Design a protein around this nucleic acid. Sequence first.
DNA 1: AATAAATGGAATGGGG
DNA 2: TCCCCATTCCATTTAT
Length: 91
Amino acid sequence: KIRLYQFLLDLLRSGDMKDSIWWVDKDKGTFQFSSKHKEALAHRWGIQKGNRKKMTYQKMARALRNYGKTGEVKKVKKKLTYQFSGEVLGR
DNA sequence: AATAAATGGAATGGGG
DNA sequence: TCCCCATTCCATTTAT
């Protein structure tokens, strides 16, 4: 099964949900979600995973928070903005 | 207040 | 057994 950070990186690479997520500074790996259109992206994550309940942005962001310590994704001090690690970006 | 976002502990569920 | 990689639930705090 695909990991959440890889799902998000793949979306950014494909441009399939450009109104829900975008690079802010792609060289640094910073990206941001749409305030108004993030829920459609969260729904897609839950469906891809086959989860029991409907996925929400809040639950997706709760999973993103768990990457902070291991480092794959960190929260940036702007709203709805995160940053991939260099290791994630290279792979 | 209404609306949104953030913080994050804890219980529960996946697939080895 | 017990870690992986989340998902789900819930209470609380901050937004300037």
